Amino acid sequence: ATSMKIIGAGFGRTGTLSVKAALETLGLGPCYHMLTTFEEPGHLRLWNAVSRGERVDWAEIFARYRSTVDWPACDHWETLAKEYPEAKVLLTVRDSERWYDSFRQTLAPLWSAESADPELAEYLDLVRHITAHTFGGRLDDRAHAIAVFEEHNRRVRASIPSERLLVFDVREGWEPLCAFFGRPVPPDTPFPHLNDRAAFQELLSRRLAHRG
Numbered sequence: 083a084t085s086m087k088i089i090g091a092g093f094g095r096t097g098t099l100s101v102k103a104a105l106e107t108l109g110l111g112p113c114y115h116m117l118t119t120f121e122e123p124g125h126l127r128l129w130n131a132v133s134r135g136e137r138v139d140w141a142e143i144f145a146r147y148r149s150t151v152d153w154p155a156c157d158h159w160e161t162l163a164k165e166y167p168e169a170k171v172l173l174t175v176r177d178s179e180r181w182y183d184s185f186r187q188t189l190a191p192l193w194s195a196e197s198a199d200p201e202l203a204e205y206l207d208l209v210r211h212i213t214a215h216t217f218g219g220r221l222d223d224r225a226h227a228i229a230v231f232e233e234h235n236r237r238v239r240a241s242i243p244s245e246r247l248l249v250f251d252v253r254e255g256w257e258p259l260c261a262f263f264g265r266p267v268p269p270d271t272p273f274p275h276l277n278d279r280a281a282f283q284e285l286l287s288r289r290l291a292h293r294g
């Protein structure tokens with residue numbers, strides 16, 4: 083069977099696309115990511131149902147996945163860790179000021195957009211929901227967004243038994259990730275460094291064009 087082994091609790095802009103690539107290389111995928119929501123039909127509607135508080139069977143989202151990182155799932159780490167008690171929790175972190183610059187320059191413009199494109203309505207509803215419930219409706223307030231990031235990270239660390247949680251900065255490379263799961267380090271392989279910008283812009287254009 084396909085079993086969920088890793089719940090990613092880190093926010094976007096903490097290297098989650100790189101971690102997705104790394105986990106899949108280690109045989110711990112398929113790994114879910116924000117980008118996956120655009121590749122799985124029905125999944126943005128499922129995530130908005132989750133966001134509204136509907137009863138949603140998590141298997142309808144994750145049955146084919148062994149790991150998840152990034153939004154939208156990272157906001158639901160607490161429920162997911164109870165759903166999947168044998169899964170580890172992976173918290174990716176980053177220094178807060180640089181995290182916010184990354185968030186403000188890449189995600190906030192997308193999340194704050196108005197679009198007349200019907201194909202983006204489900205996505206915008208979802209990231210507006212995240213803006214509302216995780217950020218209290220404000221993305222432009224630097225100190226506030228940083229306070230949300232730091233409290234999110236702290237609440238994960240306070241809530242998950244220590245042996246079940248890895249706190250990881252992607253700048254550390256393979257070694258602590260591999261050691262935590264007891265897997266070998268891939269030889270002569272740099273840790274992935276995926277910017278997670280242009281890939282999403284391509285998925286947006288594919289969705290507007292109805293490609294795939």
Ligand SMILES: Nc1ncnc2c1ncn2[C@@H]1O[C@H](COP(=O)(O)O)[C@@H](OP(=O)(O)O)[C@H]1O
Nearest residue numbers: 094095096097098099100184274275276277278
């Ligand atoms: N191996 C690595 N070392 C350092 N930063 C990395 C990295 N892999 C990804 N990142 C940074 O993580 C951010 C993307 O994270 P995510 O996939 O969660 O959206 C990007 O930040 P920047 O916007 O500063 O380039 C990317 O540069």
